[PDB]
């Protein structure tokens, strides 16, 4: 996308989202990042939405195929699960590459830095979901470290109802439960996050209240599933 204007890439990413063309969306936002300028709040959302949808479809397909593969235990099901898995890993590597070159190092504000570090944790978490061999532990620690640094910043710099802070804690909780084999840590994080946000709701406008309570409902839904 080197020959397209940054503003045109952003405009086309928004069109692709409206058309539910998420692979296109992601390629446009990848091109926008590679222009080298920092991203605005809205632009960070476009980047995240695009890749979340792309890898979300890959994860869903991988789970279908992995389930078929486990029921079977010719080479076809394993081969095709491997194909999808490699394609998923490539998308995760691409996002992690964008964060590392050079979104995170240039992100100084809490809202941008926490957002990118949450993504870094998320895409390592997706790598961990399919990891088996020599690096599954290292991948898990990479996810944990990114999430932890984002948590530390968000607790210092953001109110407990901040949607980015809440979504980070939600996803770190899922990491604890689903990846790190730490359901007690997952439950404790979700409960403390929910309770501290509840106590801060009185400070919010009607619209911010809606933003925060919507994410708190997701924390509550997980707690209901986990307890």
């Amino acid at each position: 996308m080197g020959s397209m204007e940054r503003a045109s890439l952003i405009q086309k990413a928004k069109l692709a989202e409206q058309a539910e063309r998420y692979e296109d969306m992601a390629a446009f936002m990848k091109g926008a990042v590679e222009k080298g300028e920092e991203l605005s709040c809205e632009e960070r959302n476009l980047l995240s939405v695009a890749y979340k949808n792309v890898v979300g479809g890959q994860r869903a397909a991988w789970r279908v195929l992995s389930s078929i593969e486990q029921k079977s235990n010719g080479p076809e099901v394993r081969e095709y699960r491997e194909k999808v898995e490699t394609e998923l890993q490539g998308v995760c590597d691409t996002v992690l590459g964008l964060l590392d070159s050079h979104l995170i190092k240039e992100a100084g504000d809490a809202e941008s830095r926490v957002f990118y570090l949450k993504m870094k944790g998320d895409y390592y978490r997706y790598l961990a979901e399919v990891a088996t061999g020599d690096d599954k532990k290292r991948i898990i620690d990479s996810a944990r470290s990114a999430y932890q640094e984002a948590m530390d910043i968000s607790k210092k710099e953001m109110p407990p109802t901040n949607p980015i802070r809440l979504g980070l804690a939600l996803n770190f909780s899922v990491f604890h439960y689903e990846i790190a084999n730490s359901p007690e840590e997952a439950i404790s994080l979700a409960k403390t996050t929910f309770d501290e946000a509840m106590a801060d709701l009185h400070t919010l406008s009607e619209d911010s209240y809606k933003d925060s309570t919507l994410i708190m409902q997701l924390l509550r839904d997980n707690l209901t599933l986990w307890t």
């Binding site: 939405v49 899922v174 933003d211």
Partner: peptide, 8 residues
């Protein structure tokens, strides 16, 4: 267990 969605 649900993780965060991108859009409302």
């Amino acid at each position: 267990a649900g993780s965060i969605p991108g859009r409302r």
